[PDB]
RNA sequence: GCCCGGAUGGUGGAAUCGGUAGACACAAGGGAAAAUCCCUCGGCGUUCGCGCUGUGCGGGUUCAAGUCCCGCUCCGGGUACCA
């Protein structure tokens, strides 16, 4: 064994090692429990970034002790490979999108190799390349021919109308939003959110004859119990009702222009005369900038009695405020500043006077029903799934259009519809629509147009997840028994920025892939872990110019208090530095730490300990290099242990009926930080914790004696014990340390350790005496000691009723 | 302005169970320039044994609150009129 620790002597080799034999490489093996860790997949930018490393290195840790207690474990890595910065990428440079993204991949992949993640690289997928899209592709044909898909032109982001294909999400949205309940192991946060974003909404559509105009307008109300303090109706700018006004009334043209382009109200009288159905009074119709066209029916029945948003337009614009609900105690509402908001029991209503809410709601809507003019109505705030892009870079959409007019899917032996990868870039149109003789086909016999607009790439991130279970599966998109054995994922990791595109996105694909035979769960992950940032100090200062120019932490050369605080800072140019404290990392503040630097100068051990130690995974961590360096250290402290003991030779069998006291007592303390460890790691997930006993264990096998045979056996099972505690996150050194140790067989398939029960056992326990709550002595008693036994040891005591056993005596 | 989180030593963080506050580590300081190693370290007071105090500020429950409830202050993050 060398004396020295040197990662660039182990890390490689053991890295080759298991590369060569395959050694995280599994199947669908049914004499074994399964477990399916997964990581968000990265894009291949060019190069990791450090929340990269702690996403990964927090899937590592799980895969890795799951595998050494037994199970069969899935870990797969991949690529999400299409969008945009590689277009941008391949204008700059002089290249094309195909091979810079290649070429970022296989450096990548070696950073990734590099930190040691045990990934079953047998399953990797690029989503790029035709034997990954092609199965999307066909299975957009599907949903097609299930009339859950269509196309139409909508608004995006300045403002263009330009036509979209949808998947119709919304036909999902009571599931996504119901299954919510089931996800019992994803944070509040994630839920909440996508309920809020889900934004169910339980209303009526009411219709109104329009005088002097040829269509009826139909507004959406969640609140018809306030039917009767309608003072006006008010549509969006793009309503075709004020399109129309628009023509005569060069007021309203402008402001329909003004809107198109550009949270105070602003509005223009249509001239438009609607009749109220109940009282038959005409009520004005005005264009307004708050009612959104792209939602229910893109018009309102304004109470600004009773909508705040209508209450201040209407004192705008002077028109009339009418009140029709009570306040809590029965009064009619102070209306002279603001609307009243709650439900209550009407008043000023007619016939509906003094029914409650819900029987205001009920009767109200149930006449306009029968009336013919109204119907209750579900809308959701959630939009369907715009999945078109004007982009090159991405899978091909497999729609044609006939020579006809006709719109129909790619036929099944055209698919995949392939990208073509050798092109050159114009900076300005997609090589696919710039060329005419590209998207020119034939289909049904006759000649068509091929789609040139491509998917976006959640389109390809929605399912890459099961895939991943049947990756070389040419027959069809899933092989339905390697999915349903890994399926559904056990834990998730990855940020919470995912949470309302993505991690919806993907929750909607399983139920696709579920309600077409592929799956048989209803639900694609179990748990979801969102790992927090890694922050770093940031530093500017001010040029001569006004101007704030930011200084890498490394460049900034500071001043500390006596209590360490940074008081002053320089950067070596002279500038006055300001400390901004700790910082989400970007390029913009100039704080990016490079996570192939740190495994260039520690060791990927040494980056991953630290990554683990430093915070909750759940938590932000604070990137420190005074706290690298405190693990680096720790590991060399473990090489020296294992040194000192393994340059002593081997190891008599360790005898428990003879051991002495002492000897007994650190045995124990060896194995109820196994029973900790365990439990932090597989239950808690408290990684910082876990790795915390381990180094308070660490300090007393630093102390204990290691001359007589017992006390070596002894060192031997608690080294053997910390060399695969300390696996998971440290595998390179722990697989070195274990051979040095003679372990049996290699350390990743070497079973989990396991606390003796025996070991365990207490004679005593420790009871603290309190009198009114402040400790006033401390006692040893039997662990079998009855209340009134411990008492009596408690009267004793020359400075000495509430008693938990065990623990605590209080007087 | 909304919805959802936070607040513990000089610092990151422990306290899982309402029951010994500060494990573990960083930073300091003392020990045998740099590096390694070993001991001290919440604040104040001290006759060196210890005493009083302490989890943003208030209050509620409790025999007992960092923990559960409710206010106030101050810190972060999402969402852009969804009728
Ligand atoms: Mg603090």
Same mark, same amino acid.
């Given at each position: ?71 069969? &474990? ?30 970022? *991949? ?90 809020? %974003? ?23 109300? @969640? ?97 009339? $405020? ?31 006077? =003094? ?41 091909? $959409? ?11 899917? @790619? ?10 990868? !050798? ?5 300005? @149109?997609?090589? *696919?629509?710039?060329?005419?003789? %590209? ?13 040139? !607009? ?45 949470? *309302? ?72 140019? =002279? ?23 740190? &495994? ?146 290699? *350390? ?24 009114? =709550?402040? &400790? ?13 036994? &411990? ?21």
């Amino acid at each position: 064994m060398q004396e020295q620790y040197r990662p660039e002597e182990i890390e490689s080799k053991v890295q080759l090692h298991w590369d060569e034999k395959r050694t995280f490489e599994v199947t669908e093996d049914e004499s074994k429990e399964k477990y399916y860790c997964l990581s968000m997949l990265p894009y291949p930018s060019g190069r990791l970034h450090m929340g990269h490393v702690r996403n990964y290195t927090i899937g590592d840790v799980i895969a890795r002790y799951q595998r050494m207690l037994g199970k069969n &474990v899935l870990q797969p890595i991949g690529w999400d490979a299409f969008g945009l910065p590689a277009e941008g990428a391949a204008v700059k440079n002089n290249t094309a999108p195909a091979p810079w993204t290649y070429d970022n *991949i296989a450096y990548m992949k070696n950073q990734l190799k590099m930190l040691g993640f045990g990934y079953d690289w047998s399953r990797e997928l690029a989503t790029c390349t035709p034997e990954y899209y092609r199965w999307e592709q066909k299975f957009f044909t599907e949903l097609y021919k299930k009339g859950l898909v269509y196309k139409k032109t909508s608004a995006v982001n300045e403002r263009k109308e330009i036509p979209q294909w949808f998947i119709k999400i919304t036909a999902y949205a009571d599931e996504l939003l119901n299954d919510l309940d089931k996800l019992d192991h994803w944070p509040d946060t994630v839920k909440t959110m996508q309920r809020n %974003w889900i934004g169910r909404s339980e209303g009526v559509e009411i219709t109104f004859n329009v005088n002097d105009y040829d269509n009826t307008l139909t507004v959406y109300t @969640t609140r018809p119990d306030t039917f009767m303090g309608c003072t006006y109706l008010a549509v969006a700018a793009g309503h075709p009702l004020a399109q129309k006004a628009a023509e005569n009334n060069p007021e309203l043209a402008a402001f329909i222009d003004e809107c198109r382009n550009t949270m105070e109200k602003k509005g223009v009288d249509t001239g438009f005369k609607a009749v109220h159905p109940l009282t038959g009074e005409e009520i004005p119709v005005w264009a307004a900038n708050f009612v959104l066209m792209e939602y229910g029916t893109g018009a309102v029945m304004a109470v600004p009695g009773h909508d705040q948003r209508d209450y201040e337009f209407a004192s705008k614009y002077g028109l009339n $405020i009418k009140p029709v609900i009570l306040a809590a105690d029965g009064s009619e509402p102070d209306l002279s500043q603001q609307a009243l908001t709650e439900k209550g029991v009407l008043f000023n209503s007619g016939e509906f006077n =003094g029914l409650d809410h819900e029987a205001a709601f009920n009767a109200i809507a149930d006449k306009l029903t029968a009336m013919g003019v109204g119907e209750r109505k579900v809308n959701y705030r959630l939009r369907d799934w715009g999945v078109s892009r004007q982009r090159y870079w991405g899978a091909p $959409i497999p729609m044609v259009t006939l020579e006809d007019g006709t719109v129909m899917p @790619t036929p099944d032996d055209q698919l995949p519809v392939i990208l073509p990868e !050798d092109v050159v870039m114009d900076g300005i @149109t997609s090589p *696919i629509k710039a060329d005419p003789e %590209w998207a020119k086909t034939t289909v049904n016999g006759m000649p068509a147009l091929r789609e040139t !607009d491509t998917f976006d790439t959640f389109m390809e991130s929605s399912w890459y997840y099961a895939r991943y279970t049947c990756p070389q599966y040419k027959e069809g998109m899933l092989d339905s028994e390697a999915a349903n054995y890994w399926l559904p994922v056990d834990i998730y990791i990855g940020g919470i920025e995912h949470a *309302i595109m993505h991690l919806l996105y993907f929750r909607f694909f399983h139920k696709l892939m579920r309600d077409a035979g592929m799956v048989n769960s209803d639900e694609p992950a179990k748990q979801l872990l969102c790992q927090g940032m890694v922050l770093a100090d940031a530093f500017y200062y001010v040029g001569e110019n006004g101007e704030r120019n930011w200084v890498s932490p490394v460049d900034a050369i500071v001043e500390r208090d006596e209590k360490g605080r940074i008081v002053k800072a320089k950067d070596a140019a =002279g500038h006055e530095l300001v400390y901004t404290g700790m910082s989400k990392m970007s390029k913009s503040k100039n704080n990016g730490i490079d996570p192939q630097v740190m &495994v260039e100068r520690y060791g990927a051990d040494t980056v991953r300990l630290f990554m683990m130690f430093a915070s909750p995974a759940d938590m932000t961590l604070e990137w420190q290099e005074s706290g690298v360096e405190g693990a680096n250290r720790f590991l060399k402290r473990v090489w020296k242990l294992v040194y000192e003991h393994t340059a002593k030779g081997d190891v008599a069998a360790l005898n428990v009926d003879a051991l002495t006291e002492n000897q007994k007592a650190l045995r124990r303390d060896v194995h109820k930080t196994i029973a900790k460890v365990t439990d932090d790691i597989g239950r808690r997930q408290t990684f910082n914790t876990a790795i915390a006993a381990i180094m308070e264990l660490m300090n007393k096998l630093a102390k204990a004696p290691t001359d007589g045979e017992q006390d070596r056996a002894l060192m031997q099972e608690a080294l053997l014990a910390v060399v695969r505690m300390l696996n998971p996150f440290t595998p390179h050194i722990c697989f070195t340390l274990w051979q040095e140790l003679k372990g049996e067989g290699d *350390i990743d398939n070497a079973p989990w350790p396991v606390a003796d029960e025996k070991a365990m056992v207490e004679d005593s326990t420790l009871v603290v005496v309190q009198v009114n =709550g402040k &400790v006033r002595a401390k006692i040893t008693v039997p662990v079998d000691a009855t209340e009134e036994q &411990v008492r009596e040891r408690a009267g004793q005591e020359h400075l000495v009723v509430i008693y938990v056993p065990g623990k605590l005596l209080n007087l």
